[PDB]
Design an enzyme around this catalytic site. Sequence first.
Site, mmCIF file in Angstrom:
data_model
loop_
_atom_site.group_PDB
_atom_site.id
_atom_site.type_symbol
_atom_site.label_atom_id
_atom_site.label_comp_id
_atom_site.label_asym_id
_atom_site.label_seq_id
_atom_site.Cartn_x
_atom_site.Cartn_y
_atom_site.Cartn_z
ATOM 1 C CG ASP A 176 -1.943 1.124 1.199
ATOM 2 O OD1 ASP A 176 -1.772 2.127 0.468
ATOM 3 O OD2 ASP A 176 -2.937 0.996 1.941
ATOM 4 C CD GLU A 179 -3.748 10.363 -1.105
ATOM 5 O OE1 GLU A 179 -3.545 11.388 -0.409
ATOM 6 O OE2 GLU A 179 -3.739 10.381 -2.353
ATOM 7 N N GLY A 180 -4.820 4.197 -1.228
ATOM 8 C CA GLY A 180 -5.326 3.114 -2.061
ATOM 9 C C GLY A 180 -4.477 2.782 -3.277
ATOM 10 C CE1 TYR A 262 17.595 24.387 -27.130
ATOM 11 C CE2 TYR A 262 17.621 26.509 -26.011
ATOM 12 C CZ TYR A 262 17.607 25.127 -25.961
ATOM 13 O OH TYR A 262 17.600 24.479 -24.742
ATOM 14 C CB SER A 275 18.157 22.335 -16.775
ATOM 15 O OG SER A 275 19.567 22.254 -16.718
ATOM 16 N N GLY A 276 18.853 20.604 -19.768
ATOM 17 C CA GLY A 276 19.293 20.697 -21.150
ATOM 18 C C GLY A 276 20.761 21.018 -21.403
ATOM 19 C CG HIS A 280 26.612 20.208 -28.356
ATOM 20 N ND1 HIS A 280 26.890 20.929 -29.498
ATOM 21 C CD2 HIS A 280 26.088 21.090 -27.474
ATOM 22 C CE1 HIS A 280 26.554 22.193 -29.312
ATOM 23 N NE2 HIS A 280 26.057 22.316 -28.095
ATOM 24 C CB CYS A 298 25.654 23.348 -24.644
ATOM 25 S SG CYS A 298 23.965 22.726 -24.726
ATOM 26 C CG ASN A 300 28.938 25.003 -27.788
ATOM 27 O OD1 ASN A 300 28.631 25.543 -28.846
ATOM 28 N ND2 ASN A 300 28.038 24.580 -26.916
#
EC number: 2.3.2.-
Length: 351
Positions: A176, A179-180, A262, A275-276, A280, A298, A300
Amino acid sequence: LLVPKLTASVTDGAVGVTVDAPVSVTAADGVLAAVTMVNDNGRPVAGRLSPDGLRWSTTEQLGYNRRYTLNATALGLGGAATRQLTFQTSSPAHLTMPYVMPGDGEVVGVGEPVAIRFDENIADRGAAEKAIKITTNPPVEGAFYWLNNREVRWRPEHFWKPGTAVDVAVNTYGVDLGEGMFGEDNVQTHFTIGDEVIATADDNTKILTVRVNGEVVKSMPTSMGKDSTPTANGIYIVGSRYKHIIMDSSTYGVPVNSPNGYRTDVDWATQISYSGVFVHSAPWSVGAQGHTNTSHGCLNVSPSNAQWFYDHVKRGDIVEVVNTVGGTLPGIDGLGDWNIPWDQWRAGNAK
Ligand SMILES: *C(=O)[C@@H](C1=N[C@H](C(=O)O)[C@H](SCC(=O)OCCC)[C@@H]1C)[C@@H](C)O
């Protein structure tokens, strides 16, 4: 002489019998001659009788919302005893299925937390934690902390030691969860910690330095977040990696057609925050890398260094950013767990 005694793990007339454990019957002053358990429809559950004939137990999963009837007979030198018991199992209002990361049999980096995500909000966090059994070898202290209403994380105080086995049994079936809400199924995964890989991005040098078990193996010029969209300082856990991916700002809340929006296709992308933030390939900024910050946040780097990172960094490895004009990566980012002070994490937030 004594009459055989029958004892069952359930009582006749019981309701809300939880289905996280088997049902059993034991004989005393005799042995079990016959045990059947049958659902409302008439179908037998069956299980196994111990060789000495003293203990019978179901051997398959018992269902929610079932009315079972147990019939048992014990025979002993002193005669016979028979009992019939009918009981009803838990009736959930809702079911939730847990999903665990990392994957079974994976090898991951020293920053990888155990992650259990439920497909529904959990009203009783404590019940969830109690149903989750973590084994570590070598054994190490760790604790649960919730990132949101659905996902809980477990980790040690410090980065894992390489060579550690981690076993995660999420035993929520029949439990359980408030709340079920009951667990839809059990899930079980196991993973192992690999080499210590920590890559540090220092905004003072704009170099991303990759250390494997303490030794520098790679030094990547990088261009981080420009002053208006800076890269947050802190500890990042490496997530997924992509040979190529379309970066969509709307994924992270920001409309494409907006000033900070973007939608760009990029190569060799390694995710290090929800958050991205990614490491890369950035062909367009190779001249800035090692000198000036120009990105949306990022890290880069050059095409070949981004591909190197993709090839040589793994889920659970660590990226640390230092000396930027950003703040600190949120502890509840999704890959920011290590930024939460141990005293706070260890205290948890189940209540
Ligand atoms: C990371 O900073 C984000 C992601 N990386 C970049 C970047 O260069 O910062 C793109 S913007 C690229 C663009 O506007 O034109 C393409 C070449 C100039 C995108 C913002 C996200 C995932 O954090």
